[PDB]
Amino acid sequence: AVCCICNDGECQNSNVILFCDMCNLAVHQECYGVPYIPEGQWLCRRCLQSPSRAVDCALCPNKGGAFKQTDDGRWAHVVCALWIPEVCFANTVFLEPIDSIEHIPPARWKLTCYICKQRGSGACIQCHKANCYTAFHVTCAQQAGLYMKMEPVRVRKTAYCDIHTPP
Ligand SMILES: [Ca+2]
Ligand SMILES: [Zn+2]
Ligand SMILES: [Zn+2]
Ligand SMILES: [Zn+2]
Ligand SMILES: [Zn+2]
Ligand SMILES: [Zn+2]
Protein backbone atom coordinates (compact mmCIF):
# COMPACT_ATOMS: atom_id res chain seq x y z
CA ALA A 1 0.00 0.00 0.00
CA VAL A 2 1.31 3.39 -1.07
CA CYS A 3 0.76 7.12 -0.35
CA CYS A 4 -1.19 8.54 -3.32
CA ILE A 5 0.47 11.95 -3.02
CA CYS A 6 4.21 11.14 -3.03
CA ASN A 7 3.83 7.60 -4.44
CA ASP A 8 6.06 6.20 -1.70
CA GLY A 9 5.37 3.44 0.82
CA GLU A 10 6.68 4.34 4.27
CA CYS A 11 6.93 1.97 7.23
CA GLN A 12 7.51 5.18 9.19
CA ASN A 13 6.03 4.96 12.70
CA SER A 14 5.54 8.68 13.42
CA ASN A 15 4.72 9.82 9.89
CA VAL A 16 2.49 6.87 9.07
CA ILE A 17 0.22 6.07 6.16
CA LEU A 18 -3.38 6.81 7.07
CA PHE A 19 -6.28 5.04 5.39
CA CYS A 20 -9.56 6.91 5.07
CA ASP A 21 -12.14 4.75 6.79
CA MET A 22 -14.65 5.49 4.05
CA CYS A 23 -12.89 5.79 0.68
CA ASN A 24 -9.71 3.89 1.62
CA LEU A 25 -7.57 6.85 0.55
CA ALA A 26 -3.94 6.14 1.50
CA VAL A 27 -1.74 9.09 2.47
CA HIS A 28 1.28 10.05 4.57
CA GLN A 29 0.25 12.12 7.58
CA GLU A 30 2.68 14.78 6.40
CA CYS A 31 1.72 14.61 2.71
CA TYR A 32 -1.98 15.26 3.40
CA GLY A 33 -1.45 17.62 6.34
CA VAL A 34 -2.84 15.69 9.30
CA PRO A 35 -1.76 17.34 12.59
CA TYR A 36 -2.03 14.13 14.63
CA ILE A 37 -3.30 10.56 14.54
CA PRO A 38 -6.81 10.36 15.96
CA GLU A 39 -7.98 7.68 18.37
CA GLY A 40 -10.61 6.02 16.23
CA GLN A 41 -11.54 6.31 12.57
CA TRP A 42 -9.87 8.80 10.25
CA LEU A 43 -11.72 10.49 7.40
CA CYS A 44 -10.20 12.49 4.57
CA ARG A 45 -11.56 15.96 3.81
CA ARG A 46 -13.69 14.66 0.92
CA CYS A 47 -15.44 12.00 3.02
CA LEU A 48 -16.08 14.51 5.81
CA GLN A 49 -17.92 16.66 3.27
CA SER A 50 -20.28 14.87 0.82
CA PRO A 51 -19.33 11.20 1.54
CA SER A 52 -21.52 9.87 -1.28
CA ARG A 53 -20.55 12.07 -4.23
CA ALA A 54 -17.32 12.31 -6.18
CA VAL A 55 -15.69 15.71 -6.40
CA ASP A 56 -13.93 17.29 -9.38
CA CYS A 57 -10.38 18.57 -9.23
CA ALA A 58 -10.18 22.22 -10.28
CA LEU A 59 -6.80 21.50 -11.93
CA CYS A 60 -7.17 18.20 -13.82
CA PRO A 61 -9.77 15.76 -15.22
CA ASN A 62 -9.00 12.81 -12.91
CA LYS A 63 -11.26 11.75 -10.03
CA GLY A 64 -9.34 9.45 -7.67
CA GLY A 65 -6.84 10.43 -4.99
CA ALA A 66 -6.38 12.96 -2.18
CA PHE A 67 -8.51 16.13 -2.26
CA LYS A 68 -8.72 19.36 -0.26
CA GLN A 69 -11.22 22.18 -0.65
CA THR A 70 -9.99 25.38 -2.28
CA ASP A 71 -10.56 28.86 -0.88
CA ASP A 72 -13.02 29.62 -3.69
CA GLY A 73 -15.76 26.97 -3.67
CA ARG A 74 -13.94 24.11 -5.40
CA TRP A 75 -11.88 20.98 -4.72
CA ALA A 76 -8.37 20.11 -5.85
CA HIS A 77 -5.86 17.28 -5.58
CA VAL A 78 -3.06 17.94 -3.11
CA VAL A 79 -0.62 16.62 -5.76
CA CYS A 80 -1.92 18.99 -8.47
CA ALA A 81 -1.54 21.87 -6.00
CA LEU A 82 1.98 20.75 -5.09
CA TRP A 83 3.16 20.53 -8.67
CA ILE A 84 1.53 23.52 -10.39
CA PRO A 85 3.97 26.33 -9.45
CA GLU A 86 1.43 29.16 -9.04
CA VAL A 87 -0.92 27.24 -6.71
CA CYS A 88 -0.44 27.51 -2.92
CA PHE A 89 -1.64 26.16 0.41
CA ALA A 90 -2.85 28.89 2.79
CA ASN A 91 -1.67 26.75 5.70
CA THR A 92 1.45 24.81 4.85
CA VAL A 93 1.18 22.52 7.87
CA PHE A 94 -2.45 21.45 7.39
CA LEU A 95 -1.94 21.80 3.60
CA GLU A 96 -5.30 23.51 3.16
CA PRO A 97 -7.12 25.30 1.74
CA ILE A 98 -5.65 25.13 -1.73
CA ASP A 99 -5.55 28.69 -3.12
CA SER A 100 -4.04 31.14 -5.66
CA ILE A 101 -5.53 29.09 -8.49
CA GLU A 102 -6.38 32.45 -10.17
CA HIS A 103 -2.59 33.04 -10.43
CA ILE A 104 -2.21 30.22 -12.96
CA PRO A 105 -1.39 31.58 -16.44
CA PRO A 106 -4.20 30.89 -18.99
CA ALA A 107 -1.46 29.23 -21.05
CA ARG A 108 -1.51 26.21 -18.70
CA TRP A 109 -5.15 25.68 -19.61
CA LYS A 110 -4.40 25.95 -23.29
CA LEU A 111 -1.78 23.17 -23.30
CA THR A 112 -2.72 19.67 -24.44
CA CYS A 113 -1.95 16.79 -22.03
CA TYR A 114 -0.10 14.18 -24.07
CA ILE A 115 -1.34 11.40 -21.83
CA CYS A 116 -5.10 11.99 -21.87
CA LYS A 117 -4.99 14.12 -25.05
CA GLN A 118 -7.29 16.73 -23.51
CA ARG A 119 -6.98 20.48 -23.83
CA GLY A 120 -8.69 22.90 -21.45
CA SER A 121 -9.73 20.23 -18.93
CA GLY A 122 -7.03 21.14 -16.40
CA ALA A 123 -3.81 23.09 -15.92
CA CYS A 124 -0.83 21.27 -17.49
CA ILE A 125 2.77 21.39 -16.35
CA GLN A 126 5.60 20.62 -18.76
CA CYS A 127 8.65 18.40 -19.10
CA HIS A 128 11.55 19.85 -17.14
CA LYS A 129 14.01 19.11 -19.97
CA ALA A 130 15.17 22.31 -21.68
CA ASN A 131 13.35 22.89 -24.99
CA CYS A 132 10.93 20.03 -24.37
CA TYR A 133 7.43 21.42 -24.36
CA THR A 134 5.60 18.16 -23.86
CA ALA A 135 2.79 18.89 -21.41
CA PHE A 136 0.74 16.82 -18.98
CA HIS A 137 -1.75 17.01 -16.13
CA VAL A 138 -0.06 16.34 -12.81
CA THR A 139 -2.26 13.34 -12.04
CA CYS A 140 -1.94 12.02 -15.60
CA ALA A 141 1.85 12.10 -15.21
CA GLN A 142 1.47 10.37 -11.88
CA GLN A 143 -0.90 7.69 -13.17
CA ALA A 144 1.24 7.05 -16.26
CA GLY A 145 4.33 6.46 -14.13
CA LEU A 146 6.37 9.39 -15.42
CA TYR A 147 9.44 10.42 -13.46
CA MET A 148 8.40 13.05 -10.90
CA LYS A 149 10.72 13.89 -8.00
CA MET A 150 10.77 16.54 -5.27
CA GLU A 151 14.25 17.69 -4.20
CA PRO A 152 15.19 20.97 -2.45
CA VAL A 153 18.45 22.52 -3.72
CA ARG A 154 19.79 24.62 -0.82
CA VAL A 155 11.92 22.56 -2.81
CA ARG A 156 12.60 21.76 -6.49
CA LYS A 157 10.00 19.60 -8.23
CA THR A 158 11.04 18.01 -11.54
CA ALA A 159 8.75 16.00 -13.85
CA TYR A 160 9.80 14.57 -17.22
CA CYS A 161 8.14 13.04 -20.27
CA ASP A 162 9.20 9.46 -21.03
CA ILE A 163 11.82 10.63 -23.57
CA HIS A 164 13.67 12.69 -20.93
CA THR A 165 13.59 10.48 -17.83
CA PRO A 166 16.89 11.49 -16.13
CA PRO A 167 19.82 9.24 -15.03
CA1 LIG B 1 -18.73 24.45 -5.00
ZN1 LIG C 1 3.32 10.64 0.99
ZN1 LIG D 1 -12.07 9.47 2.12
ZN1 LIG E 1 -6.12 17.25 -9.95
ZN1 LIG F 1 -4.22 14.52 -18.83
ZN1 LIG G 1 10.51 15.88 -22.40
Author numbering: 274 to 427, 438 to 450
Can I see the authors' text?
The catalytic MOZ subunit is coupled to three non-catalytic adaptor proteins: BRPF1 (bromodomain plant homeodomain (PHD) finger 1), ING5 (inhibitor of growth 5) and hEAF6 (homolog of Esa1-associated factor 6). BRPF1 acts as a scaffolding subunit, linking MOZ, ING5 and hEAF6 together into the functional complex. This conserved arrangement of zinc-binding modules, named a PHD1-Zn-kn-PHD2 or PZP domain, is found in a set of eukaryotic proteins, including Jade1/2/3 (PHF15/16/17).
To define the spatial organization of PZP, we obtained a 2.05 Å-resolution crystal structure of the BRPF1 region, encompassing PHD1, Zn-kn and PHD2 (residues 267–454). The structure shows a globular architecture of PZP with the three domains being fully integrated. Five zinc-binding clusters formed by the C4HC5HC5HC2H topological motif stabilize the overall fold. The three domains are joined through a zipper-like network of hydrogen bonds and hydrophobic interactions. The structure of PZP reveals a unique fold for zinc-coordinating modules and suggests that this domain may represent a distinct functional unit. The superimposition shows that the histone-binding site of the PHD1 finger is located on the side, which is opposite to the interface of PHD1 with Zn-kn-PHD2. The histone-binding site is not occluded in the BRPF1 PZP domain, pointing to a likely similar mechanism for recognition of histone H3 tail. One of the basic clusters contains a Zn-kn residue K383 and the K390 and R392 residues of PHD2, whereas the second cluster contains K422, R427 and R439 of PHD2. Our structural study demonstrates that many of these residues are found at the zinc-finger interfaces, suggesting that the structural stability of the PZP domain may be compromised in the cancer-relevant mutants.
